Symmetry: D2
């Protein structure tokens, strides 16, 4: 039949099971609800999508913990967002987010962020700007790491063009890891639908990204060393993430990834609504911070 065209990207946060890897610390609750310093882990990737201009977001979690995410985040109306929820009853790979989220995505562009990924740095809005404005193909970011063998790894030719992707190579071609933020056009659901499980029994995002690379439609932007990309894969790195955020916030008197603040600065909520959000937390430092936002110019 005839369609009519007259595009506005949706977000997905994958906040499912990290298995038994961090047990016993994660036996009672999902990793993405653990605090990083002063706020739940999922605030950080949520703030990243909000900074990209994305207001319609799907949170994917385990059946057990979906109510906890819903109690925390609600339907998003308090922050000028619309949040929906889906369950992932078995952790079958990152690319499953597109099958789980097929009806949510519909015919729109999308962005996937991992619920345990934290980003920090200057001009990040503009880094997210470039990817968000590409209405065709896929956009990912590459970041120099110590241990690229843990990640999807990008190989560049002498001219700096991305030429191959390898998932967890034993002998990485570079130290550039693909970060856990991915922008896709309308092709991604069909690409994901045709994936077959890897030997590990997982639907791999690296295979989705290679499909775009083979089409000549993968943009790989470098996220430079002046940004911090942290992912909280071990108890040690979780502690380090906490200390990192605390050092920054206590130095600056500003918070990293405060969703209320980002919504207020994006003009998705106004002063009066921000005042209402501050009221219940008025006796703790978080509520006091929200109140200070109303009567301070921050450049």
């Amino acid at each position: 039949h005839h369609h009519h065209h007259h595009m506005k990207r949706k977000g997905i946060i994958l906040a499912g099971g990290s298995g038994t890897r961090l047990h016993p610390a994660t036996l009672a609750i999902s990793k993405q609800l653990l605090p990083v310093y002063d706020k739940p882990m999922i605030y950080y990737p949520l703030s990243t999508l909000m900074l990209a201009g994305i207001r319609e977001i799907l949170i994917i979690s385990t059946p057990q913990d979906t109510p906890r995410f819903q109690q925390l985040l609600g339907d998003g109306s308090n922050w000028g967002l619309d949040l929906q929820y889906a369950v992932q009853p078995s952790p079958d790979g990152l690319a499953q987010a597109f099958l789980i989220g097929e009806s949510f995505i519909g015919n729109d562009l999308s962005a996937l962020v991992l619920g345990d990924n934290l980003y920090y740095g200057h001009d990040f809005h503009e880094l997210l700007g470039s990817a968000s404005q590409r209405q065709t193909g896929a956009s990912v970011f590459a970041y120099h790491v110590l241990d690229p063998e843990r990640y999807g790894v990008v190989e560049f030719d002498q001219g700096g063009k991305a030429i191959s992707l390898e998932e967890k190579p034993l002998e990485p071609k570079s130290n550039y890891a693909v970060t856990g933020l991915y922008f896709y056009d309308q092709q991604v659901v069909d690409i994901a639908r045709d994936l077959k499980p890897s030997p590990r029994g997982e639907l791999e995002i690296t295979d989705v990204n290679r499909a775009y690379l083979e089409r000549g439609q993968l943009s790989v932007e470098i996220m430079g060393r002046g940004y911090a990309w942290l992912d909280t894969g071990t108890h040690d790195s979780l502690l380090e993430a906490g200390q990192f955020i605390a050092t920054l916030e206590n130095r600056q008197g500003l918070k990293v990834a405060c969703p209320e603040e980002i919504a207020y600065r994006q003009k998705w909520i106004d002063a009066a609504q921000l005042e209402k959000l501050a009221a219940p937390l008025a006796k703790n430092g978080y509520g006091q911070y929200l109140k200070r936002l109303l009567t301070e110019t921050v450049y």
Copy 2:
């Protein structure tokens, strides 16, 4: 006499929100294990196997799911709820049927202890059949706690809850040992001006009868602060540093049960299986074939 244990892992208000909006803080990790493993381990080191866990109504199933009936660790665990956070002394009303005619010990669910000869420091406390025992610890900020005043001879002469002008820098820690009088003492308490049933009022009732032993927990012990986001982080880094230096874990309940002979090598081996692919199960397996002094 038998001494039963109680862990009070109740509601911390909105003080650490939004970090604790989704889950009570005693279920959050300090480094590599749930916070509640630490006070549970303190009770187990004191020789206590029958333990009541008190939490909010919402989070009890999460404590029940986490720890079970205790049989896997040679423990006998029970659960109860504190509907509203109306004072630590409420633990003894909630736990009255659990305690019965036995001796008791209460530990706060967010308190972490570290140091040498803790098994022996708890032992002296545990073996007193009469009176109550508490521990006093020198802190920077005594006004946050129950504060002990001593006379020139070193005798405890008063207790004040959150004094505006503290009489000393010695705070009462979150571990309390009680004889058979405590339930009856708790039952006669009235709410404070702040509206709570105060453990300090329980402790003063013992003090007035000369039945409160206040032992100093020395500066060589760590009693770690988890009252702020800052202190939470510091405690994690503290545990991290010790464990990574030593290759030994702090407050591993499976290990403590094994060393107490509450479970045998065959049971420890079964416990190590599920987590065999990560650091915790690996640690438990190594316990079977290493002598640790």
Copy 3:
């Protein structure tokens, strides 16, 4: 007499006495020789000047510790720099750097950096670019902090224009502190020469900066929240700086403020010289890092 004109900025690092403030930790050696994680504190501001394109640099320190800085840094030839040394026998204020450094500066533009100031973030080169290219007036940077009362504080009007500077105000007009990096034109020595000591008995850099502000020649650029500016004023903040750097380096496998690296990337030293510098440290991680630089492309 007649002059002839046919400009190339010099750097000064003030690494003098921080008095008895951090005693006993600093009784045996200067604060600016204390390590921040894996390298001496002074590497960080030195790297900042190098990133600004500055190769001719004066290090000002106490008479007692000048030999220690000289043993560490030499005459700079190893890194494609020219380093000179001057002493500050009494800590009489930051603005004294221009009197001490008068002959060194000569008729050139200059930049002053505090020897205990660390900077980190994306596009910092370009932030330093704007200030370095202003051949007239002065340039400073303002950074939102928790405790502006400890600093020189900038007041902005509703349009964002800097309108006043106050040194350690009890009731700060804003939370924007002036950071410890200052760019000056040829007027600064004369401005400094005419300063009188403040009530505290110090020649104040805030007075130098106000002189420029009153002339309409002070540029105040915002250093945004996506940058880290740390200054190591307490034992606590020193520890935090150390942890911050360690988290970044161990995540990335890249070093912050490695002068050898910056000189190599600026083409002030070539591959062969970098190889020579790596040789003496070849058995430790620092030397191994220098060696890796030669056979890796870092974007």
Copy 4:
């Protein structure tokens, strides 16, 4: 008999360069005080007042300038140099005239100890008039140290320096107590295959004669690692966390002298004056008017 102390604060090679290019690492701070305050404090807690500080030729004046002749802290300090880092046992050759006919104790200048009843753990070691005493501590990485092997009955039966296949996870810590035999034992040592005069060879000489006491330093003690940039940082954060929780300092020599009655209140007051405007002098002044148990 009198027991004299030695702190070996010698050269650490190029291992932590460039961080330590300008100054030896034992003069760098761990949090709020020079690293050497920590092992110095360990000797003072052991009751030792006559102490020889051994350092590189370049940095001795910096140790001399820092600590003086010790008279301000009720100590008797002397200095000597180790020209080349050719083994820890060289301390006994360098210190031979200092030691004379007395008992001795050696502590490494980069070793930090924390825990309860340390004064008493050093006391038992200090009061043995014959033989040698060392402490063994469970670590993650025994291959970095002198490693102790025990038989099934718990008896130390061998020592190996940096074994490729360690026999246990028990490392010998950097505190050693010796009788009058050690100088003569050190004098007869030959360099190892690695070219050093090994303290482990000294300790094995005592072991062969059944005169080596190997006491376990339990997991409730912290023996902190300052061998890497990472472990340096961890130690600082460790001290920070304790001191900020307690409002008491770890290894404050002025405080320890005061408590040992080696200096009186009038002397402590004079010591507090110079630093009266910062946290350290403030701490010292507060010591005059607070009872700390």
